[PDB]
Structures are given as C-alpha cells and as structure tokens.
C-alpha cells in the first residue's frame, strides 16, 4: 500500500481534488488507499470509489474496442499481414484492464461486501461486483469465460434480490443495477428478451412509485429511467 502512510481523510480529500482535475487514475489510487484503511465507506465515499474506477476502466474498454476492431480487420480475407503488433498491443491493454478489474474485485472481496449490511451499501457493492465481472467477460475467451459470466450473473442476482426486498422501485441504486443487469443480459448472456423484459418492468414499476418522491428524488430517479427507455429504444 503506497497510500498506507496517508490519512484516510486526506485520501478522500485528494480523491475529490483528483476528480475536479479529471485525474481518474489518481482518484482511483486515493480511493483504493481509503478502502485499505479497513473502515466501512459512507455513501459519498462509495460513489467516489465507483466514479474513479468506472472512468479508468471505461477508458481501457474504449481503447480495447478500438484495438480489437483493428485486429479483426487485419484478420479478414484480403488483409496485408502487419505482424504480431496489433495483437500484442491489444493484449497489453487487455491485461491492464483485467488488472484494474481484479483490483476492484479484490477490494470488494477484502472486505467491503462482507461488512456491508445495509441495503444501500450491499446492493451498491454487489452491483459493482457484477459490473467488473461483466468487464472481464467482455474480453474473455478461454476456459474461464463461462465461469466469469456466471460470476457476474450471480453478483447481479444477489443485488437484485436484496433491492427488491429492501428498496423502493425508484431507488436510484436499484434502477442503475437493473439498467446494468439488463445490459448484461443483452450484451454478455445473449439473452435480449430477458434484457428487454427487465428494462421494461423496471421502468414501469418505477413510474408507478414516482408519486411518492420529492422534486429532487424525482429528478434522480427519472434520469435513470430515461436510460432504461433509451436502451429499450435501441433494442426494439
């Protein structure tokens, strides 16, 4: 732990500064250091952790997709052999991506999930676990691809079961979990009908609970509801 000598509160402060500076690798390192202090994370702190790693892995995923596309074209019928370089560099980015995912999954397993008892924390972390296994699945091709997919599915499913029992249908964590699990079905599990059903049912159950919300809560919930609709429009 290179952050072992820094105060927890200083790490959180610097994560916020790194966010303002769009230095997301630094932000992720600061928030990894904060997690490794061993204390549970508050709501704000959980979201700093997720924002940081989502931005880091999001950049890696975008790069991997560019390189994968170049690699597949170099493998089409009629292409001039360019040598091993495209594959090598795609593999380099892939390995770095897998490393970030393993780091996040490691933080969740040591020991964020096991200490998370409230629905808002436990569902949040299990959603993250599903998300980072999903990112591993996006690049997986070996003896373990089915097991990676099942690890994502299992984490999402536990998160879903808790969220349906313990949170209202408009809860933004519950909505975001369903959004992402629906994308898992469509893009990873080759289950577009499940993806569409889940998005539609989530949207409709949220619609019916909006009347209970304040103006600010309404804005939060309807934002994610619009993403569900966006995906449904993409898929139908």
């Amino acid at each position: 732990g290179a952050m072992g000598s820094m105060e927890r509160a200083s790490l959180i402060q610097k994560a916020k500064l790194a966010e303002q500076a769009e230095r997301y690798e630094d932000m992720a390192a600061f928030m990894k250091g904060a997690v490794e202090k061993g204390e549970e994370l508050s709501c704000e702190e959980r979201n700093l952790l997720s924002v940081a790693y989502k931005n880091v892995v999001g950049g890696q995923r975008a790069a991997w997709r560019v390189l994968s596309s170049i690699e597949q074209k170099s493998n089409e019928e009629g292409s001039e052999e360019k040598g091993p370089e495209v594959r090598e560099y795609r593999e380099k980015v892939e390995t770095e991506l897998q490393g970030v995912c393993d780091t996040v999954l490691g933080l969740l397993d040591s020991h964020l999930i096991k200490e998370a008892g409230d629905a808002e924390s436990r569902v949040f972390y299990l959603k993250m676990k599903g998300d980072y296994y999903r990112y591993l699945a996006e690049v997986a091709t070996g003896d373990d691809k089915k097991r990676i997919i099942d690890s994502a599915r299992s984490a999402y499913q536990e998160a879903m079961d808790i969220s349906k029992k313990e949170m209202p249908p408009t809860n933004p964590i519950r909505l975001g979990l369903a959004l992402n699990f629906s994308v898992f079905h469509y893009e990873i599990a080759n289950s577009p009908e499940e993806a569409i059903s889940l998005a539609k049912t989530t949207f409709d159950e949220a619609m019916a609970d909006l009347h209970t919300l304040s103006e600010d809560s309404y804005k939060d919930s309807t934002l994610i509801m619009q993403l569900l609709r966006d995906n449904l429009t993409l898929w139908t």
Binding site: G176, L179, N180, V183, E187, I224, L227, D230, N231
Partner: peptide
C-alpha cells in the same frame, strides 16, 4: 453501445 451507470 447501450447505457450503463
């Protein structure tokens, strides 16, 4: 790509 959060 579809939306995720």
């Amino acid at each position: 790509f579809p939306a995720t959060v």
